[PDB]
Amino acid sequence: ARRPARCYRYCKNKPYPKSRYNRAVPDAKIRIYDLGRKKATVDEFPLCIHLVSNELEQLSSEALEAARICANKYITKVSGRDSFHLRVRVHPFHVLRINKQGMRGAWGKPHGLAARVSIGQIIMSARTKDSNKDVVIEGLRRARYKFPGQQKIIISKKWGFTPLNRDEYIAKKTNGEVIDDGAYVKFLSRKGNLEANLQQFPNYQYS
Amino acid sequence: TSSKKSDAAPASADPAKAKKK
Amino acid sequence: GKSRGYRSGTRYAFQRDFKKHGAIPLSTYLKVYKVGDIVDIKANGSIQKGMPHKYYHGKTGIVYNVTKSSVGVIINKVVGNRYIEKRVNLRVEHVKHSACRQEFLNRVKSNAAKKREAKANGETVYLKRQAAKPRGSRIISTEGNIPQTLAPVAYETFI
Amino acid sequence: KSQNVMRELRIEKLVLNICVGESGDRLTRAAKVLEQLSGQTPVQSKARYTVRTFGIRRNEKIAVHVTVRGPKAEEILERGLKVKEYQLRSKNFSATGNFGFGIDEHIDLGIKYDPSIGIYGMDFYVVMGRAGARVTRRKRARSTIGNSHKTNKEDTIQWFKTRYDAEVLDK
Amino acid sequence: KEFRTSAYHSRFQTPFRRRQEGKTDYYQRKRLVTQHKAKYNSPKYRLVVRFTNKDIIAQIVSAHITGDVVFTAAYAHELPRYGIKYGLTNWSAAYAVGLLVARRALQKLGLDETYTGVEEVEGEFELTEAVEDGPRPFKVFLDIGLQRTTTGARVFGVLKGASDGGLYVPHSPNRFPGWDIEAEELDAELLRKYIFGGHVAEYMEELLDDDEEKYKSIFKNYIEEEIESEDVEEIYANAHEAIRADPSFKPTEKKFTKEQYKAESKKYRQQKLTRAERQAKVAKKIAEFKAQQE
RNA sequence: GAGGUAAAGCGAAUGAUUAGAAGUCUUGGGGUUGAAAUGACCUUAACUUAUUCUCAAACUUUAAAUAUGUAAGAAGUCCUUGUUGCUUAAUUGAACGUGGACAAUUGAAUGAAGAGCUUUUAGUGGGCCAUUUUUGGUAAGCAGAACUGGCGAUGCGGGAUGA
RNA sequence: CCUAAGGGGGACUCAUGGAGAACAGAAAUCUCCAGUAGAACAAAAGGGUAAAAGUCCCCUUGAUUUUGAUUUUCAGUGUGAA
RNA sequence: GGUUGCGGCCAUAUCUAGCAGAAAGCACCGUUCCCCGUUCGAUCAACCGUAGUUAAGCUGCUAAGAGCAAUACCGAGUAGUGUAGUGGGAGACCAUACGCGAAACUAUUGUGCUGCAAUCU
Ligand SMILES: [Mg+2]
Ligand SMILES: [Mg+2]
Ligand SMILES: [Mg+2]
Ligand SMILES: [Mg+2]
Ligand SMILES: [Mg+2]
Ligand SMILES: [Mg+2]
Ligand SMILES: [Mg+2]
Ligand SMILES: [Mg+2]
Ligand SMILES: [Mg+2]
Ligand SMILES: [Mg+2]
Ligand SMILES: [Mg+2]
Ligand SMILES: [Mg+2]
Ligand SMILES: [Mg+2]
Ligand SMILES: [Mg+2]
Ligand SMILES: [Mg+2]
Ligand SMILES: [Mg+2]
Ligand SMILES: [Mg+2]
Ligand SMILES: [Mg+2]
Ligand SMILES: [Mg+2]
Ligand SMILES: [Mg+2]
Ligand SMILES: [Mg+2]
Ligand SMILES: [Mg+2]
Ligand SMILES: [Mg+2]
Ligand SMILES: [Mg+2]
Ligand SMILES: [Mg+2]
Ligand SMILES: [Mg+2]
Ligand SMILES: [Mg+2]
Ligand SMILES: [Mg+2]
Ligand SMILES: [Mg+2]
Ligand SMILES: [Mg+2]
Ligand SMILES: [Mg+2]
Ligand SMILES: [Mg+2]
Ligand SMILES: [Mg+2]
Ligand SMILES: [Mg+2]
Ligand SMILES: [Mg+2]
Ligand SMILES: [Mg+2]
Ligand SMILES: [Mg+2]
Ligand SMILES: [Mg+2]
Ligand SMILES: [Mg+2]
Ligand SMILES: [Mg+2]
Ligand SMILES: [Mg+2]
Ligand SMILES: [Mg+2]
Ligand SMILES: [Mg+2]
Ligand SMILES: [Mg+2]
Ligand SMILES: [Mg+2]
């Protein structure tokens, strides 16, 4: 049925997504990309840990699903279902093709899905508390076994899923420049309608 | 006599979208 | 099935510029083209009559014939190991005066002006153009600008 | 000044619609009723497309409508408001300051009844506007109307209550 | 969905400045202005005819890249100098403006003795014919702008005046008042009636014996000059003659100088705030917003 | 001058796509408080608003590198006025001209066993390989294109050996 | 495939959204506002198009005659088309 | 300098919401015998300039306004890329050498200029 994963590791063809030109494409095995306590506020989980690709490579949707399941199972088993928020950061949009007379009319049919990842591209991100660091790292390290190639586990300099360092976030928070938005936050802008900006951020200490 | 407008450009029987629940 | 029609592969070449579709600004129709003028060719997709072939989009040539709404332009096209003289009839919507004349025609006047004035002063002037030459010697003052020492920085991850 | 003479509300036009669901003699008799009421030749509207449920087809002459302006529009409007006994609802006024109602029998207006004609219901719509709407309707230099000069629901409601001594419900 | 997003404004392509104003029909403008490329820099000359609520503007224009250049111009408000003081927007006032602009342009050119025009206006359709062994008549094309082409429109009054004044303006008579569409011939009698204000005089006569109060309100200026219908024609008939005697343009004497006008207008109209002023405004609005902190 | 590929973008159009948050009078349903009220409520799902993760050979505002068209004068630039059945309202222009002015730094570099021209005829019309770009294919000492350089057609030193 | 779906001129603005009007309802017809084209343009797709090339109206046959030049494919041969 | 007619470039000119507008101009505005077009003198046509108004159009100003335009010890000499090696690496790919070199992002500034004719406190 399914060929060995070694047949589709490298980005040899141009991107081939589902479209109006290929229509009979199956669905990716991964459908859920956010796990754990995804409704947790930004302030609850300051520590972010990434699983980063050190390869220009293709990861199948099957491998993504397997790694997601492994990491989620381990972390909920060790620390509880509400101790983390796991996010899969690569979406499989590239369609693989299978052919099987001979080489005549050999354009293949859709066979599976893979995400094309670059070097330094984040594959999985996990926001949690500091005390659960050693757990979350081991959750990603096991998931590494389900992937081909080399991956690195990198502790982020930033607060959770924000683009601000762990010191700039505190500065923008004590300055009233950050408000909650559910699982994410909104930052203050010094452009646009002054009244709407002021209304959205009441605690803004202007200088 | 009187009527001659329809400044639109309609397709076939096109009961327009709408037509749902 | 192979496809090779007249306007094949001109999807982006013959597009109007972004936020510039529609009516032609009328300076295009008020310009006056004379035989011997140098003109750039750029097909306007919204006028399909007197339209150039896709080869001439981006080519520059000499006007040889002027008609009611069109000009004839002479282009030299490579066919194998030589050039062939092509005579294309183009409506004036696809044509604009070439800016290479205005640079060279100004240098002729400037050279003429320089020649007459040195002659007035009974001296000489050199009109040949020169490529950029290596720079001369110079002295760098350090008052307020004492050199600051730099070093390569260590490696960090910012993700 | 908001109390300017040119800010005076007044009727722009009245449009009378009879959407008889079929084509032929009945639509013609509705057109006869409209020509009787307005004194002007009305215009018949054709269905824009086909619906089998309503028994209509594209380009089948379905409805008939007519536009009246001036004193005759005012006379027809009060003749129709008598049938409504001068009582509309708040829901009946659009955000652009236009309003409408629908009578159910055309003999209540005050015209002779004919057995051949029968009775048709009728739809009334009044288009409101201040002076200067020609800006939006002229050919050359067409522009938009300023915000204070715009017609809205509240101004039209108050003007209607004042000019007709009627009641605007809200059920 | 909110429709007017920032992306909607980003991708909107504004039309030509004078098209968004609704003043120039660029289709018609392109067809009128564009000149045969083999006639090079010889310009096409346009008869721009525009009607305001009180005035008729007729100009002879040639177009260039830096902008149009006016050759001559005749306005309807010049008419009081020639003896027409009221009804400056008649069809006949249009005829008078066309005749005036034709004579003024020909005076500027030098084609006065040649191409006098139709000196005896009988209402017959006629085109300015070229003189053998002589310069061709000044050729001009009609530019009615956004105004609709209707049989009886006032723009063709300027047309007929300019045609009768000696300018060559190509046209047909099926848009003149008095054209019988059923019997495709021109009733030159009715056209001649319209040229000399006959319809207005007939309105005066018909209103005076029917609604005297309305005649008193509509035709006030006529009442205080004691000008009746029977001498209406003379008002035009003399004016025509006067227009041909001295068609030169005489500018109005200005009660103030250009500098005085500029200083007076410059006293009004607000001037933009400095960056610092609006920064201070923003700071004040921020401080005064602290009172609704709840 | 032309271009629309790489990169880039998606709180920009189109199309795909993950997650919450706050709202609204077609909320789409379950249980209410209902006697009904639909008049509220608990809930889930929709949309809307400001955000969020990830994408495109047959998407795109922007937009390279390499490559590509034209020009760099004497057949040039300027002045005056001749020809015509073409053109202008014209004594306006168009083209081709008579007469006059601008002298070797005559208007970039570099090179040039010098430039231009004609006739006639052979063989050939199975190709293949290497870097880089690249399509089908799991792939292949597989099949197919782009630019250049090579082998064929070529010996010589090296790669033991080898188109 | 089309006597218009060709040609000329003129008037209008399309898809769509919001708010309103007896029967009338998600869908009949009418009204205002909004509406950069999100429609439509015979057809496959791309391009192009808004006082238009779209919708509607009026008049027409330039879808005519004589033969050359030219563009593309190109050997700078033919055919088709322009 | 204001305003009108005709324009060039075609948003630094557009969009939203407020506020102001002397003179003239423009505008709204009044009327339906006549030329003319409509279901409707609403649009178009004609007449009056006579009865009225700056409410609107138009113009200017305001907005940590949207958009747009311009600039850069912004990001970034990053991504990409011409050229080179008997460079690294099993590979995927990566580093280096002589050259070329973005976009997003960020910050700041700005928000039509102008030609011909006419006219005006
Ligand atoms: Mg491949
Ligand atoms: Mg096949
Ligand atoms: Mg691994
Ligand atoms: Mg093909
Ligand atoms: Mg293009
Ligand atoms: Mg054609
Ligand atoms: Mg026109
Ligand atoms: Mg370039
Ligand atoms: Mg391409
Ligand atoms: Mg790409
Ligand atoms: Mg999207
Ligand atoms: Mg990418
Ligand atoms: Mg740029
Ligand atoms: Mg010659
Ligand atoms: Mg040598
Ligand atoms: Mg041979
Ligand atoms: Mg042979
Ligand atoms: Mg042979
Ligand atoms: Mg052989
Ligand atoms: Mg190869
Ligand atoms: Mg091969
Ligand atoms: Mg083989
Ligand atoms: Mg290549
Ligand atoms: Mg080699
Ligand atoms: Mg050889
Ligand atoms: Mg060798
Ligand atoms: Mg050897
Ligand atoms: Mg070896
Ligand atoms: Mg047609
Ligand atoms: Mg048209
Ligand atoms: Mg609208
Ligand atoms: Mg077909
Ligand atoms: Mg057509
Ligand atoms: Mg034929
Ligand atoms: Mg034929
Ligand atoms: Mg050929
Ligand atoms: Mg051929
Ligand atoms: Mg005033
Ligand atoms: Mg009126
Ligand atoms: Mg009118
Ligand atoms: Mg005002
Ligand atoms: Mg701004
Ligand atoms: Mg090796
Ligand atoms: Mg480099
Ligand atoms: Mg970009």
mmCIF file of N, CA, C and O in Angstrom, chain D residues 1 15 25 27-28 33 35 39 41 52 56 58 76 78 87 91 105 110 113-114 117 133 136 143 147 163 167 169:
data_model
loop_
_atom_site.group_PDB
_atom_site.id
_atom_site.type_symbol
_atom_site.label_atom_id
_atom_site.label_comp_id
_atom_site.label_asym_id
_atom_site.label_seq_id
_atom_site.Cartn_x
_atom_site.Cartn_y
_atom_site.Cartn_z
ATOM 1 N N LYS D 1 -26.509 76.573 10.006
ATOM 2 C CA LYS D 1 -27.734 76.479 10.791
ATOM 3 C C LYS D 1 -28.583 75.293 10.371
ATOM 4 O O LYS D 1 -28.930 75.139 9.199
ATOM 5 N N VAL D 15 -44.129 55.530 -5.654
ATOM 6 C CA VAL D 15 -44.116 54.401 -6.578
ATOM 7 C C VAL D 15 -45.176 53.389 -6.154
ATOM 8 O O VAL D 15 -45.211 52.952 -4.992
ATOM 9 N N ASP D 25 -54.508 38.695 -18.774
ATOM 10 C CA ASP D 25 -55.626 39.606 -18.539
ATOM 11 C C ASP D 25 -55.572 40.235 -17.152
ATOM 12 O O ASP D 25 -55.855 41.428 -17.001
ATOM 13 N N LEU D 27 -53.010 40.893 -15.137
ATOM 14 C CA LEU D 27 -51.994 41.937 -15.051
ATOM 15 C C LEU D 27 -52.446 43.173 -15.816
ATOM 16 O O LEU D 27 -52.215 44.309 -15.383
ATOM 17 N N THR D 28 -53.104 42.964 -16.955
ATOM 18 C CA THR D 28 -53.624 44.080 -17.733
ATOM 19 C C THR D 28 -54.665 44.857 -16.934
ATOM 20 O O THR D 28 -54.703 46.090 -16.981
ATOM 21 N N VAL D 33 -56.169 49.590 -13.458
ATOM 22 C CA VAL D 33 -56.390 50.225 -12.160
ATOM 23 C C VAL D 33 -55.353 51.314 -11.924
ATOM 24 O O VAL D 33 -55.675 52.417 -11.458
ATOM 25 N N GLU D 35 -53.567 52.999 -14.185
ATOM 26 C CA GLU D 35 -53.798 54.128 -15.082
ATOM 27 C C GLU D 35 -54.999 54.950 -14.643
ATOM 28 O O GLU D 35 -55.032 56.166 -14.859
ATOM 29 N N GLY D 39 -53.520 58.477 -13.682
ATOM 30 C CA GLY D 39 -53.667 59.243 -14.903
ATOM 31 C C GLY D 39 -52.486 59.163 -15.845
ATOM 32 O O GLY D 39 -52.444 59.911 -16.828
ATOM 33 N N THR D 41 -49.645 56.451 -17.985
ATOM 34 C CA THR D 41 -49.438 55.078 -18.425
ATOM 35 C C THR D 41 -48.407 54.415 -17.522
ATOM 36 O O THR D 41 -47.286 54.922 -17.406
ATOM 37 N N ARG D 52 -40.307 27.962 -10.675
ATOM 38 C CA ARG D 52 -41.466 27.091 -10.898
ATOM 39 C C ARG D 52 -42.468 27.148 -9.753
ATOM 40 O O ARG D 52 -43.674 27.006 -9.985
ATOM 41 N N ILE D 56 -43.883 31.424 -12.335
ATOM 42 C CA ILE D 56 -43.383 32.491 -13.179
ATOM 43 C C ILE D 56 -42.182 31.974 -13.956
ATOM 44 O O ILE D 56 -41.522 31.007 -13.568
ATOM 45 N N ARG D 58 -38.780 33.497 -16.639
ATOM 46 C CA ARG D 58 -37.992 34.663 -17.008
ATOM 47 C C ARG D 58 -38.687 35.397 -18.148
ATOM 48 O O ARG D 58 -39.233 34.776 -19.064
ATOM 49 N N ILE D 76 -52.738 61.164 -3.956
ATOM 50 C CA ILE D 76 -52.808 59.710 -3.869
ATOM 51 C C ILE D 76 -52.292 59.230 -2.518
ATOM 52 O O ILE D 76 -52.834 58.284 -1.932
ATOM 53 N N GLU D 78 -52.383 60.798 0.481
ATOM 54 C CA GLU D 78 -53.366 60.960 1.553
ATOM 55 C C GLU D 78 -54.607 60.106 1.316
ATOM 56 O O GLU D 78 -55.218 59.628 2.281
ATOM 57 N N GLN D 87 -52.028 55.365 10.233
ATOM 58 C CA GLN D 87 -51.325 54.656 11.301
ATOM 59 C C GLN D 87 -50.363 53.638 10.691
ATOM 60 O O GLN D 87 -50.779 52.543 10.303
ATOM 61 N N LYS D 91 -41.304 50.043 12.069
ATOM 62 C CA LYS D 91 -40.574 49.116 11.214
ATOM 63 C C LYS D 91 -40.653 49.514 9.745
ATOM 64 O O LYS D 91 -39.843 49.047 8.935
ATOM 65 N N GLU D 105 -57.114 46.175 -0.850
ATOM 66 C CA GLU D 105 -58.149 46.335 -1.864
ATOM 67 C C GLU D 105 -58.085 47.728 -2.473
ATOM 68 O O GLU D 105 -57.971 48.722 -1.749
ATOM 69 N N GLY D 110 -61.140 54.901 -3.279
ATOM 70 C CA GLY D 110 -62.179 55.842 -3.644
ATOM 71 C C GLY D 110 -62.439 55.924 -5.129
ATOM 72 O O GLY D 110 -62.775 56.991 -5.650
ATOM 73 N N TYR D 113 -65.926 50.656 -8.594
ATOM 74 C CA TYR D 113 -65.647 49.232 -8.650
ATOM 75 C C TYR D 113 -66.308 48.667 -9.895
ATOM 76 O O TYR D 113 -67.460 48.983 -10.204
ATOM 77 N N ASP D 114 -65.562 47.832 -10.606
ATOM 78 C CA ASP D 114 -66.063 47.154 -11.775
ATOM 79 C C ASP D 114 -65.920 45.654 -11.590
ATOM 80 O O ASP D 114 -64.837 45.179 -11.217
ATOM 81 N N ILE D 117 -63.026 44.313 -13.669
ATOM 82 C CA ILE D 117 -61.699 44.548 -13.110
ATOM 83 C C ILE D 117 -61.445 43.647 -11.907
ATOM 84 O O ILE D 117 -60.368 43.053 -11.776
ATOM 85 N N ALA D 133 -31.248 66.940 -4.371
ATOM 86 C CA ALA D 133 -31.027 65.566 -4.808
ATOM 87 C C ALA D 133 -30.631 65.498 -6.274
ATOM 88 O O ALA D 133 -30.085 64.479 -6.712
ATOM 89 N N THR D 136 -27.208 64.114 -7.162
ATOM 90 C CA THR D 136 -26.974 62.690 -7.356
ATOM 91 C C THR D 136 -27.620 62.144 -8.622
ATOM 92 O O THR D 136 -27.403 60.974 -8.951
ATOM 93 N N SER D 143 -22.270 64.181 -7.625
ATOM 94 C CA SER D 143 -21.551 64.120 -6.361
ATOM 95 C C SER D 143 -22.455 63.448 -5.324
ATOM 96 O O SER D 143 -23.502 62.882 -5.655
ATOM 97 N N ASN D 147 -23.667 64.984 5.072
ATOM 98 C CA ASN D 147 -24.260 64.159 6.120
ATOM 99 C C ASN D 147 -25.460 64.837 6.776
ATOM 100 O O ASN D 147 -26.488 64.192 7.011
ATOM 101 N N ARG D 163 -46.589 66.415 9.689
ATOM 102 C CA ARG D 163 -47.344 66.835 8.511
ATOM 103 C C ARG D 163 -48.669 66.098 8.338
ATOM 104 O O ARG D 163 -49.572 66.632 7.687
ATOM 105 N N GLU D 167 -50.025 58.405 13.515
ATOM 106 C CA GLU D 167 -49.341 57.752 14.616
ATOM 107 C C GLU D 167 -48.390 56.743 13.999
ATOM 108 O O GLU D 167 -48.764 56.012 13.077
ATOM 109 N N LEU D 169 -46.578 53.488 14.969
ATOM 110 C CA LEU D 169 -46.578 52.465 16.005
ATOM 111 C C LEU D 169 -45.191 51.832 16.007
ATOM 112 O O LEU D 169 -44.260 52.376 15.410
#
